[PDB]
């Protein structure tokens, strides 16, 4: 179970338990808790330099955004196009649409749709009213388009702190700034990203379950050329242990983040994210940085994330070299069977 869940944190002014574990979903693997530390704490600077997850609790990274809510955003964000994904269920499986023309026989069960902010809230209001079970997840990189109040907020982020982290870790350019607004219960299934991430919680509480790259074997990512590249094939809600036996060996690092917490998700680390049930609307901003460049002459034994990049590159080479990504599997199997297995 979630031994790493944590005894819920008690909010100041004794306004109750921020959340209780009945708002966490039930899963078949154990976990240990991610450390919640202060930014000044050197234990937390060492966790980051060693690419290990840590919850930073007092960065003020997005202090101005803590006032955010739907009303405030609607009135001040502009008339921009905001990507919004629909879903039949709590699970939000996402598809790379450009990879979409390889496989045609894995149909789409979560779809994008541009909206103006007022229409999005519109949709939640009516879904709200009719008690519907459709779920929505807004996910959009904010850009200069936005309102005057929201540019001032963005400018009030603690750029000095994060910009220092980018330099101290030798990381590369901030790639993007997604904003996520999601409904209670919504789940982003387990996946890994190729970039260092600072996951900055604003409104609501999110449960984050991470796994290290070295548990690649237990999480069974889709093929690289598949639309669900970098997602785990394993249904966390009902695992198929015959197809994925080593998911019985998976142990996670877990934590619940709330307003003001910043969760460092090291690159290539798996993460599963859920907005707690009956916790209402969640709001997050993410800060993705190209990771540090790989030194010129490499140190063995390699680290797990480098082996992952290798496997990824093998799949990519073979896809181009064979003229068809769908021959990758067959060739790899003939390479292995009775030779390496
Ligand atoms: O639900 C939560 O709180 C946690 N959600 C996530 O972590 C999350 N992670 C990754 C993606 C994602 C989206 N795309 C499509 C192109 C955008 C892009 C490009 C590069 C990178 Cl590095 C990230 C994003 N590719 N990856 C979406 C997510 O929502
Ligand atoms: Zn991610």
Curated annotation (Swiss-Prot):
Q: Which reaction does it catalyse?
A: L-asparaginyl-[hypoxia-inducible factor alpha subunit] + 2-oxoglutarate + O2 = (3S)-3-hydroxy-L-asparaginyl-[hypoxia-inducible factor alpha subunit] + succinate + CO2; L-histidyl-[ankyrin-repeat domain protein] + 2-oxoglutarate + O2 = (3S)-3-hydroxy-L-histidyl-[ankyrin-repeat domain protein] + succinate + CO2; L-asparaginyl-[ankyrin-repeat domain protein] + 2-oxoglutarate + O2 = (3S)-3-hydroxy-L-asparaginyl-[ankyrin-repeat domain protein] + succinate + CO2; L-aspartyl-[ankyrin-repeat domain protein] + 2-oxoglutarate + O2 = (3S)-3-hydroxy-L-aspartyl-[ankyrin-repeat domain protein] + succinate + CO2
From the Swiss-Prot or TrEMBL record, state where the protein is found. Answer: Nucleus; Cytoplasm; Cytoplasm, Perinuclear region
Per the UniProt entry, the effect of residue 193 to E is: Loss of HIF1A Asn hydroxylation activity. Slightly stimulates 2-oxoglutarate turnover
Give the span(s) annotated as Interaction with VHL. 1-117
The residues that the entry says bind substrate are: 144, 173-175, 193-195, 230-231, 292, 313
Site positions per UniProt: Important for dimer formation: 332
- The top EC class, named as a word, is oxidoreductase
For binding 2-oxoglutarate, which residues are annotated in this chain's numbering? 137, 188, 197, 206, 286
Q: Which domain of life is it from?
A: Eukaryota
Q: Which GO terms describe its molecular function?
A: [protein]-asparagine 3-dioxygenase activity; ankyrin repeat binding; carboxylic acid binding; ferrous iron binding; NF-kappaB binding; Notch binding; oxygen sensor activity; peptidyl-aspartic acid 3-dioxygenase activity
Which amino acids does the record list as binding Fe cation?
A: 191, 193, 271
Q: Does the keyword Ribosomal protein apply?
A: no
What sequence ranges are listed for the domain JmjC?
134-304
**Is Zinc-finger one of the keywords?**
no
Question: A single GO CC term, please?
Answer: perinuclear region of cytoplasm
Keywords (alphabetical) are: Acetylation, Cytoplasm, Dioxygenase, Iron, Metal-binding, Nucleus, Oxidoreductase, Transcription, Transcription regulation
**Region of interest (Disordered), ranges:** 1-43
Q: Identify which cofactors the protein needs according to its UniProt entry.
A: Fe(2+)
Q: What is its EC number?
A: 1.14.11.30, 1.14.11.n4
**Gene3D superfamilies in UniProt:** Clavaminate synthase-like, Jelly Rolls
Enumerate the Gene Ontology biological process terms.
Answer: negative regulation of Notch signaling pathway; negative regulation of transcription by RNA polymerase II; positive regulation of myoblast differentiation; positive regulation of vasculogenesis; regulation of vascular endothelial growth factor receptor signaling pathway
PANTHER family referenced in this protein's UniProt entry, alphabetically = HYPOXIA-INDUCIBLE FACTOR 1 ALPHA INHIBITOR-RELATED (PTHR12461), HYPOXIA-INDUCIBLE FACTOR 1-ALPHA INHIBITOR (PTHR12461:SF105)
Assembly and interactions? Homodimer; homodimerization is essential for catalytic activity. Interacts with VHL and HIF1A. Part of a complex with VHL, HIF1A and HDAC1 or HDAC2 or HDAC3. Interacts with NFKB1 and NFKBIA. Interacts with NOTCH1, NOTCH2 and NOTCH3 but not with NOTCH4. Interacts with APBA3; binding inhibits HIF1AN binding to HIF1A. Interacts with TNKS2. Interacts with PPP1R12A. Interacts with ASB4. Interacts with UBE3A. Interacts with ANKS3. Interacts with NECAB3; the interaction is indirect and seems to be mediated by APBA3.
Give a short account of what the protein does.
Answer: Hydroxylates HIF-1 alpha at 'Asn-803' in the C-terminal transactivation domain (CAD). Functions as an oxygen sensor and, under normoxic conditions, the hydroxylation prevents interaction of HIF-1 with transcriptional coactivators including Cbp/p300-interacting transactivator. Involved in transcriptional repression through interaction with HIF1A, VHL and histone deacetylases. Hydroxylates specific Asn residues within ankyrin repeat domains (ARD) of NFKB1, NFKBIA, NOTCH1, ASB4, PPP1R12A and several other ARD-containing proteins.
Q: What is this protein called?
A: Hypoxia-inducible factor 1-alpha inhibitor
Q: Can you name the source organism?
A: Homo sapiens
């Amino acid at each position: 179970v979630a031994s790493g869940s944590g005894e819920p944190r008690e909010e100041a002014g004794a306004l109750g338990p921020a959340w209780d574990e009945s708002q966490l979903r039930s899963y078949s693997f154990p976990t240990r808790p991610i450390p919640r530390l202060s930014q000044s704490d050197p234990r937390a600077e060492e966790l980051i330099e060693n690419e290990e997850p840590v919850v930073l609790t007092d960065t003020n990274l997005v202090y101005p955004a803590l006032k955010w809510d739907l009303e405030y955003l609607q009135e001040n964000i502009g008339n921009g196009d905001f990507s919004v994904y629909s879903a039949s269920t709590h699970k939000f499986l996402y598809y790379d649409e450009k990879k979409m023309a390889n496989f045609q026989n894995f149909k789409p069960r979560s779809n994008r749709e541009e909206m103006k902010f007022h229409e999005f809230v519109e949709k939640l209001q009516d879904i709200q009213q009719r008690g519907g079970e459709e779920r929505l997840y807004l996910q959009q990189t904010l850009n200069d388009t936005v309102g005057r109040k929201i540019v001032m907020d963005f400018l009030g982020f603690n750029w000095n702190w994060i910009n220092k982290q980018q330099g101290k870790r030798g990381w590369g350019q901030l790639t993007s700034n997604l904003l996520l607004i999601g409904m209670e219960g919504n789940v982003t299934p387990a996946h890994y990203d190729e970039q260092q991430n600072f996951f900055a919680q604003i409104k609501g509480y999110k449960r984050c379950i991470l796994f290290p790259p070295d548990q690649f074997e237990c999480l069974y990512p889709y093929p690289v050329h598949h639309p669900c590249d970098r997602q785990s094939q394993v249904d966390f809600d009902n695992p198929d242990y015959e197809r994925f036996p080593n998911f019985q060996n998976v142990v996670g690092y877990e934590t619940v983040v709330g307003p003001g917490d910043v969760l460092y998700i090291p690159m290539y680390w798996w993460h599963h994210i859920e907005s707690l049930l009956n916790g209402g609307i969640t709001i997050t901003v993410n800060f993705w940085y190209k990771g540090a460049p790989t030194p010129k002459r490499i140190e063995y034994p390699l680290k797990a994330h480098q082996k992952v990049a290798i496997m990824r590159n093998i799949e990519k080479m073979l896809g181009e070299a064979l003229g068809n990504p769908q021959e990758v599997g067959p060739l790899l199997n003939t390479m292995i069977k009775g030779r390496y297995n």
